[PDB]
Amino acid sequence: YPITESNLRILEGEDRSEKAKELLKKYVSNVFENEKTLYIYCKYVMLHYGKDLVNEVDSLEFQIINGITNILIKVKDMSKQAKYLIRLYGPKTDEIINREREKKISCILYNKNIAKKIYVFFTNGRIEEFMDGYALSREDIKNPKFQKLIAKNLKLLHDIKLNENLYKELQVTQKVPGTRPSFLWNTIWKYFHLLNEERKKICSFDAKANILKLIDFDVLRDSIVEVESLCKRENSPIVLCHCDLLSSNIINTVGGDSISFIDFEYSCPMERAYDIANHFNEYAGFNCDWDLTPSKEEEYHFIMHYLGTDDEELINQLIREIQPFYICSHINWGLWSLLQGMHSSDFDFINYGMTRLTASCLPIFRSKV
Amino acid sequence: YPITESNLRILEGEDRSEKAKELLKKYVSNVFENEKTLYIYCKYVMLHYGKDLVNPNEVDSLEFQIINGTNILIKVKDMSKQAKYLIRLYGPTDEIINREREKKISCILYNKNIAKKIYVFFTNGRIEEFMDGYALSREDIKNPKFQKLIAKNLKLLHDIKLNENLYKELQVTQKVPGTRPSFLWNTIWKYFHLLNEERKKICSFDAKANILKLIDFDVLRDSIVEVESLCKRENSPIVLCHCDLLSSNIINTVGEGDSISFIDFEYSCPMERAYDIANHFNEYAGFNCDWDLTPSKEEEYHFIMHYLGTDDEELINQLIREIQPFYICSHINWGLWSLLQGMHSFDFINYGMTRLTASCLPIFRSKV
Numbered sequence: 247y248p249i250t251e252s253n254l255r256i257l258e259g260e261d262r263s264e265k266a267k268e269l270l271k272k273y274v275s276n277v278f279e280n281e282k283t284l285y286i287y288c289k290y291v292m293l294h295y296g297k298d299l300v301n302e303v304d305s306l307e308f309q310i311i312n313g314i315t316n317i318l319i320k321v322k323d324m325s326k327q328a329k330y331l332i333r334l335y336g337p338k339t340d341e342i343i344n345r346e347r348e349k350k351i352s353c354i355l356y357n358k359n360i361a362k363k364i365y366v367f368f369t370n371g372r373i374e375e376f377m378d379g380y381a382l383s384r385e386d387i388k389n390p391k392f393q394k395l396i397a398k399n400l401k402l403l404h405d406i407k408l409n410e411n412l413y414k415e416l417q418v419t420q421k422v423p424g425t426r427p428s429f430l431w432n433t434i435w436k437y438f439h440l441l442n443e444e445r446k447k448i449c450s451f452d453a454k455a456n457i458l459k460l461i462d463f464d465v466l467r468d469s470i471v472e473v474e475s476l477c478k479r480e481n482s483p484i485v486l487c488h489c490d491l492l493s494s495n496i497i498n499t500v501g502g503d504s505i506s507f508i509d510f511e512y513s514c515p516m517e518r519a520y521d522i523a524n525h526f527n528e529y530a531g532f533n534c535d536w537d538l539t540p541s542k543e544e545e546y547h548f549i550m551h552y553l554g555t556d557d558e559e560l561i562n563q564l565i566r567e568i569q570p571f572y573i574c575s576h577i578n579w580g581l582w583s584l585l586q587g588m589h590s591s592d593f594d595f596i597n598y599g600m601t602r603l604t605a606s607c608l609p610i611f612r613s614k615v
Numbered sequence: 616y617p618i619t620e621s622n623l624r625i626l627e628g629e630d631r632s633e634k635a636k637e638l639l640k641k642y643v644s645n646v647f648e649n650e651k652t653l654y655i656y657c658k659y660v661m662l663h664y665g666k667d668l669v670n671p672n673e674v675d676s677l678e679f680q681i682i683n684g685t686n687i688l689i690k691v692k693d694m695s696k697q698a699k700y701l702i703r704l705y706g707p708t709d710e711i712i713n714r715e716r717e718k719k720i721s722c723i724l725y726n727k728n729i730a731k732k733i734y735v736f737f738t739n740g741r742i743e744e745f746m747d748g749y750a751l752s753r754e755d756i757k758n759p760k761f762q763k764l765i766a767k768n769l770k771l772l773h774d775i776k777l778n779e780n781l782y783k784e785l786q787v788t789q790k791v792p793g794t795r796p797s798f799l800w801n802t803i804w805k806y807f808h809l810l811n812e813e814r815k816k817i818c819s820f821d822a823k824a825n826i827l828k829l830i831d832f833d834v835l836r837d838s839i840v841e842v843e844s845l846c847k848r849e850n851s852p853i854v855l856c857h858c859d860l861l862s863s864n865i866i867n868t869v870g871e872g873d874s875i876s877f878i879d880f881e882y883s884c885p886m887e888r889a890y891d892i893a894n895h896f897n898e899y900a901g902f903n904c905d906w907d908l909t910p911s912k913e914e915e916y917h918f919i920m921h922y923l924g925t926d927d928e929e930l931i932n933q934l935i936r937e938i939q940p941f942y943i944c945s946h947i948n949w950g951l952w953s954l955l956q957g958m959h960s961f962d963f964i965n966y967g968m969t970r971l972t973a974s975c976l977p978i979f980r981s982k983v
Contacts, residue, residue: 451980452980452981454977456977456980457975459831460834460971462828462829462830462831463831469829534965597969604968607826607828608826609823615821
C-alpha cells in the first residue's frame with residue numbers, strides 16, 4: 247500500500263537530482279507511510295519540479311494542511327520568505343476528474359482573476375501559489391454577511407465569457423457533442439453508467455458493490471430523465487460554474503472580509519442555477535442537516551447580491567429557476583460518492599452517497615419544483 | 616380540535632367519578648390546548664383508571680409534572696402517601712405495536728425483577744412505574760461495567776419459561792403459525808409487504824412514498840430470504856426477547872451499587888435469542904448510526920461471558936458465532952420499520968435508509 251521512507255532514500259554518492267527525478271516517477275500513488283515520508287516526497291517535488299522556484303535549499307518548512315480527494319502541503323522558505331503549495335492527487339484522477347480539462351479552466355480562471363497561479367503540472371500533482379486565509383464553515387456560508395460576498399464573487403465567475411474556441415477545447419477533452427452545451431448531464435449520466443455497469447457484476451456477499459443492487463436503476467434512470475427535463479425547462483444560462491461550492495472551498499482572507507474560491511477540479515460550463523442550488527445544499531454540510539438549507543427569504547438575500555439588483559421581479563425569477571436543481575445536485579453527488587465508495591481509500595462515501603440519493607426523493611426537496 | 620379546559624369541565628352537583636369516566640371515553644386523542652388541561656385530564660386518569668393505586672379521595676392532593684423525556688409522559692405525586700407514578704398518554708404512535716401482546720408480556724414480568732411495572736392499560740395510554748434512575752447512553756452500554764449488568768438482566772428475561780398456553784395466546788395476538796415459533800420472520804415479512812404495497816401505488820412527485828420506488832424490492836426480497844436462511848442455520852433458541860434494547864430502554868437505578876432494569880416492551884415477543892443480542896450490539900452506535908462503535912470480537916466476548924454466566928471459552932465462542940448473521944437481520948427489521956413510520960407520521964426515512972444501507976455494508980456482511 248503506502249510509499250516508505252526507504253522507498254524514497256537517496257544514498258551517498260548518488261546524484262541527488264537525478265535520483266529525486268526517478269523516485270518521483272516511480273512513486274506516483276501519493277499514499278504515504280507517514281508524515282515524514284510525505285515531506286521527503288515534497289522535498290523532491292521542490293527539487294525537480296519546482297527547481298526554478300527554490301536547489302541548495304532543503305531548509306524548507308513543510309506543513310500538511312486541510313479537500314478530501316487531494317493532499318495539500320504548504321511549503322515555507324526562510325531565506326526568501328515566500329510560500330508555495332503542493333497538491334497531490336488521490337487515486338481518483340480520471341474516473342471523476344478530467345485533468346486536461348481542469349488545466350484549461352485553471353488558466354482561464356487565473357487570467358480572469360479568480361484562481362491563483364499554478365506553477366508546475368505533473369502526472370500526480372502540481373505546484374501552486376499559496377493563498378493566506380481561512381476556510382469557511384457551513385454556518386459562515388449561511389451568514390448574510392458572507393452570502394453577500396460569496397454571491398458577488400460567484401457572479402464574477404459566472405460573468406466569464408465562453409467563446410467558440412475554448413468551448414471546443416473543453417468539448418474535445420470530455421466528449422460533449424452539441425453547440426455551446428452544459429457539461430452537467432454528460433457528467434450525471436457518466437456516473438450512472440459507471441455505477442450501472444458495476445451493479446451488473448455478480449459479486450461476493452460482502453463486496454462494496456452490494457449497496458448498488460438495493461437501488462432500482464431503472465427508476466433511477468427515469469428519475470434522472472425527469473430531473474433533466476424539469477431543469478432544462480427553466481432555461482438557465484450555461485456559464486463557467488465552480489461546481490463544488492462547499493464551505494471549505496470558500497476562503498476568507500481578512501485584509502474587512504475578502505472572499506475567494508479554491509479547488510476548481512469540478513469546474514466546467516453548466517447551468518448557472520446548478521451552481522447556486524448546489525451551494526445552497528451545502529448549507530447542510532457533510533452531515534446533511536437539510537433544515538439548514540435556505541428559506542425563500544434567504545435565497546432572496548443571496549440572489550439580490552448575485553444579480554446586483556433590488557429588482558424583485560428579476561430576483562424572484564432566478565429563485566424559481568434554481569428550484570429543481572436542488573434535486574439535480576443530490577443525484578450528482580449521490581452517484582459521485584457511491585462511485586468513490588467502490589474504489590475506497592477516510593470518508594464514509596456509501597452512507598454519504600445514499601443520504602444524498604435519499605434527499606433527491608424527499609418531499610422537502612421534491613415540493614420545491 | 617385540541618381538548619380544552621372547557622371540554623373537561625365538571626359542574627357543581629354532578630358526580631365527579633361518573634362525569635370523569637364519560638370524559639375519558641369521549642376525549643382520547645391526547646391533544647390538549649395547554650399544560651393545565653393536560654393535568655386536569657391526568658387527574659381523571661388517576662381517578663378512574665388509577666383507583667387501585669391512589670385513593671379516589673386523594674386525587675386533589677396529586678401533583679403533576681410533564682416530563683420532557685411520541686407521547687406525553689406525566690410525573691404523578693401522591694403527596695399524601697408520598698408515592699410516584701408515570702402516566703403515559705399515547706400520541707396522535709403507529710398501528711404496528713400490539714398493545715394486547717404488550718399487556719400479556721407485562722403480566723409475565725410484573726414480579727420478575729427484569730422490567731418496570733405497568734399497573735393499568737387503557738385505550739389511549741397506561742399508568743406505569745416511576746423510575747428514579749436514569750436512562751443509559753450509547754457510551755454506557757459499551758462500558759464493560761454495564762455490559763455485565765445488561766447481559767445478566769437479559770439472561771433472566773431469556774430464561775423465562777413460556778407455556779404452550781401462554782405461547783398460543785401470544786401466537787393468536789400476532790397470528791404467527793407453527794409450534795414454539797419465532798415471531799421474528801413474521802414481523803419482517805409483514806413490514807416488507809406493507810411497504811411493497813405502498814410502493815406499487817400511483818404517487819405524486821413529492822409524496823413520502825417516492826423513496827420506496829428507488830429501492831429495488833426484488834433484491835430486497837432476495838436479501839431477506841438470504842439472511843433468514845443464514846440465521847435459521849445458526850439454530851438460535853427461541854426465547855422471550857425485548858427486541859428494542861437501545862440504551863434509553865435500559866435504566867440504571869443506583870441502589871453505591873448499580874442496578875439495571877429494562878423498560879418499553881412494545882416490540883417484545885418470542886424470537887431467536889441471538890437477535891436480541893445482535894440488535895443490542897447494533898445500538899452501541901446510537902441513532903447517529905456510528906457503526907465503528909459496534910462491538911469487536913473481544914467486546915462481544917465479554918458481554919456473552921456474563922450473559923451465559925460461564926468462563927467456558929467454547930460456549931462463549933459458540934454464541935459469538937450464533938449471533939453474527941443477526942446484525943444484518945437487525946438492520947433490515949429497523950430499516951423497514953422506520954420507512955413504514957416514515958410513510959404516515961424524527962427523520963424516519965433517512966434512518967430507514969441508513970439501516971438498509973448498513974445491511975449491505977461489508978463491515979456487517981463480512982461477519983457472516
